[PDB]
Amino acid sequence: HHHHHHKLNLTCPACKVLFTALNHGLKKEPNVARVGSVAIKICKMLNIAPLDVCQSAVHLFEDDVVEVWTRSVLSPSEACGLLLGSSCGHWDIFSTWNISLPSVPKPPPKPPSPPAPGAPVSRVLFLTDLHWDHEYLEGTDPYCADPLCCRRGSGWPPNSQKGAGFWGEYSKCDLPLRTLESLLKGLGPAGPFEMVYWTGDIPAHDVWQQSRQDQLRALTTITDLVRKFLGPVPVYPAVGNHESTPVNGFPPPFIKGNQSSQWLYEAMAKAWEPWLPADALHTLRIGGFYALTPRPGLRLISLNMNFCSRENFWLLINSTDPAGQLQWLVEELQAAENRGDKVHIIGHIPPGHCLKSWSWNYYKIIARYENTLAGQFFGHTHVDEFEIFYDEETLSRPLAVAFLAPSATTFINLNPGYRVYQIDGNYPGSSHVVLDHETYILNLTQANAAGGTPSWKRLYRARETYGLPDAMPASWHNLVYRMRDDEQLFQTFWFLYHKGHPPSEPCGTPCRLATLCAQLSARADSPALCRHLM
Ligand SMILES: *[C@@H]1O[C@H](CO[C@@H]2O[C@@H](C)[C@@H](O)[C@@H](O)[C@@H]2O)[C@@H](O[C@@H]2O[C@H](CO)[C@@H](O[C@@H]3O[C@H](CO[C@H]4O[C@H](CO)[C@@H](O)[C@H](O)[C@@H]4O)[C@@H](O)[C@H](O[C@H]4O[C@H](CO)[C@@H](O)[C@H](O)[C@@H]4O)[C@@H]3O)[C@H](O)[C@H]2NC(C)=O)[C@H](O)[C@H]1NC(C)=O
Ligand SMILES: *[C@@H]1O[C@H](CO[C@@H]2O[C@@H](C)[C@@H](O)[C@@H](O)[C@@H]2O)[C@@H](O[C@@H]2O[C@H](CO)[C@@H](O[C@@H]3O[C@H](CO)[C@@H](O)[C@H](O)[C@@H]3O)[C@H](O)[C@H]2NC(C)=O)[C@H](O)[C@H]1NC(C)=O
Ligand SMILES: *[C@@H]1O[C@H](CO[C@@H]2O[C@@H](C)[C@@H](O)[C@@H](O)[C@@H]2O)[C@@H](O[C@@H]2O[C@H](CO)[C@@H](O)[C@H](O)[C@H]2NC(C)=O)[C@H](O)[C@H]1NC(C)=O
Ligand SMILES: *[C@@H]1O[C@H](CO[C@@H]2O[C@@H](C)[C@@H](O)[C@@H](O)[C@@H]2O)[C@@H](O[C@@H]2O[C@H](CO)[C@@H](O)[C@H](O)[C@H]2NC(C)=O)[C@H](O)[C@H]1NC(C)=O
Ligand SMILES: *[C@@H]1O[C@H](CO)[C@@H](O[C@@H]2O[C@H](CO)[C@@H](O)[C@H](O)[C@H]2NC(C)=O)[C@H](O)[C@H]1NC(C)=O
Ligand SMILES: [Zn+2]
Ligand SMILES: [Zn+2]
Ligand SMILES: [Zn+2]
């Protein structure tokens, strides 16, 4: 219904035909091998790390990345839409998207009330980033050329240098199974616990040679070891980013067949059946997230933060609220608000590391349900730190805080560690909020020492060391700016940051202001949050 006397519509289908031809030529197996076998020769041409890795890294990524480009950019409706305009398609890739909040008016912000005298306190264990390395070996080179050392294939160290420790090593290494058994055995004094939050990243960083059997092997092995030492204590876990292979590869639910992540989510639903109820397992299989009620007046929500990860290449195809998760979260929160319940959110990748649009909608959801939210717990960063949320309009009022627990693994150059949270206990009228938290470590210098002992000691208690009236958002907000001025205090945070094993290089003024900026930045791509630091 368009009027012309010079236009040739020969260019619109010529585009569609031509890209449609590419895809058919890329799927051909004899062509895929051509794109792999050349890659080995290219890693020498681009001055890349050991080529032996390249012969493996590019192999696993190829089939999945290609499919994503054919389904995203080289999709006829997508590419031709970029060149010729709305006439021959639409360019949807990484388009901005929003979420709709319910029509329910937002209640006035009510600060939680301090716990009454004689109010019980519950202890919550927090395991994150275990990263079991089946191929960990003692005495092997910790400074190999591969991305991951201390394992079979990294060879032995030269000049009679000191090999890898028996319990781990300060380097780009992961943990042997024994060191995780030691962690779970020494939970006597740190307990008792009412429940455990377990935010994934079970398999090691040997991403280049991870079959699906090795990923399910790590799943059931550790899930069996954890259930063994926690007994009747329920463990509520979340999906990490090393759980699938290839790493970070989590195709949303709309993708079907062998290439979907059904192989993973359905194996989880079997390993985690003793912990999760029926309705929770349903959504677990589909998209790897779920919600449940661990105790009266509290709602637990486990998000699959892979559907926000830059590293998840499958999100090109459609990066709008993958799996409908944010829409589902809003429904869960809003329902809780009506019930008068509070909510705990657990995930792997902190919201500050997500895609800009995803993170901005999460940030606005938190603010809307500030009164309903009682805790946010995440991991991934392998480090002890936090992220403060502010009001969407002015970015001046702290209204929620997310705790990024440090990792059980040594990757990279850290002490093993775990984290126990003290929360307002199980009783009607409880705020369910975090009251304080404790961090335990395994000083490797001691354990690996001759005749050493594997003793898990408490590194510190949160309020005690930082002198905090409470674990509310306003107290961490104050702490950050306190460290902006007090150098000794920051060096304490810096020391605990790395679980008590700081780097050799001192952290100067530009390194400090950057690290504090991270604590205020729960919204990705938002420099205004650090206007007061620099
Ligand atoms: C890219 O993905 C976007 C994300 O949506 C997901 O992506 C696709 C691939 C599917 O996997 C889909 O299941 C995912 O949710 C996508 O934008 C989103 O599109 C969906 C629909 O495709 C919108 O979801 C909701 O649709 C329902 C329809 O009724 C449901 O009920 C029936 C009967 O029980 C069931 O059989 C189904 O579950 C049906 O889905 C709407 O009812 C719902 O309304 C919401 O909003 C109103 C506001 O008036 C609220 O009051 C309600 O409580 C609901 O919360 C949704 O419309 C979804 O809204 C939409 N996203 C946004 C942000 O709007 C996009 O289309 C994809 N793009 C491309 C090019 O493929
Ligand atoms: C320029 O040409 C393209 C290509 O379409 C084809 O090319 C012409 C030379 C003629 O031979 C056409 O008969 C022929 O379709 C046009 O794109 C095409 O648009 C139509 C509708 O806009 C698409 O058809 C739809 O198909 C669905 C599913 O069957 C139906 O439900 C719809 O009712 C509708 O029929 C067609 O798929 C699409 N072609 C491709 C390859 O995607 C384009 O519209 C044309 N330019 C103008 C200005 O008309
Ligand atoms: C996504 O949201 C942005 C901004 O948030 C919305 O708009 C604010 C102005 C305010 O009304 C908030 O409560 C909303 O949640 C949208 O910004 C719109 O931008 C258009 C043009 O881009 C502009 O003309 C309007 O001022 C804004 N609002 C409306 C209703 O159009 C943005 O359009 C939304 N969509 C996307 C894809 O980003
Ligand atoms: C389902 O897929 C797996 C994986 O193989 C394919 O190629 C991988 C490199 C991956 O990137 C995806 O493109 C594909 O799914 C198949 O298992 C592989 O093949 C055998 C299994 O017996 C084994 O030697 C390989 O190591 C497996 N690879 C991995 C990464 O686990 C499996 O056979 C496929 N299922 C069906 C029915 O074909
Ligand atoms: C971890 O253990 C090592 C070894 O026992 C401790 O290192 C000692 O620390 C102080 C100096 O800071 C002195 O006792 C010695 O000079 C250090 N010895 C060595 C070999 O480094 C270390 O302090 C412990 N750290 C923690 C957090 O437990
Ligand atoms: Zn005319
Ligand atoms: Zn990790
Ligand atoms: Zn991670």
Author numbering: 76 to 609
Question: Can you provide the manuscript's text about this entry?
Answer:
Acid sphingomyelinase (ASMase, ASM, SMPD1) is an enzyme found in lysosomes and in the extracellular space where it catalyses the conversion of sphingomyelin, a major component of membranes, into ceramide and phosphocholine. ASMase consists of an N-terminal saposin domain and a C-terminal catalytic domain. To gain insight into the molecular mechanism of ASMase function and the interplay between its domains, we determined crystal structures of the full-length protein from mouse that reveal a conformational flexibility of the saposin domain. In one conformation, the saposin domain adopts a globular closed form independent of the catalytic domain, while in the other conformation, it assumes an open V-shaped fold that establishes an extended interface with the catalytic domain.
As observed with other saposins, ASMasesap adopts either a closed or open conformation depending on environmental conditions. By contrast, the open form of ASMasesap assumes a V-shaped conformation with its hydrophobic core exposed and its position shifted on ASMasecat such that one face of helix α3 forms an extensive 1,318 Å2, hydrophobic interface with ASMasecat. Deletion of ASMasesap almost completely abrogated activity and six interface mutants substantially reduced activity, verifying that both the saposin domain and the interface are required for membrane sphingomyelin hydrolysis. The structure of isolated ASMasecat is unchanged relative to the catalytic domain in the open form full-length protein, but analysis of their crystal temperature factors indicated that interface formation reduces catalytic loop dynamics. The location on open ASMasesap responsible for membrane lipid docking under physiological conditions likely includes its hydrophobic surface, which in the crystal is buried by a symmetry-related saposin domain reminiscent of the ‘handshake' clasp observed in saposin B dimers. In the presence of anionic membranes, open ASMasesap becomes prevalent, docks onto the membrane surface and concomitantly forms an interface with the catalytic domain activating it for sphingomyelin hydrolysis.
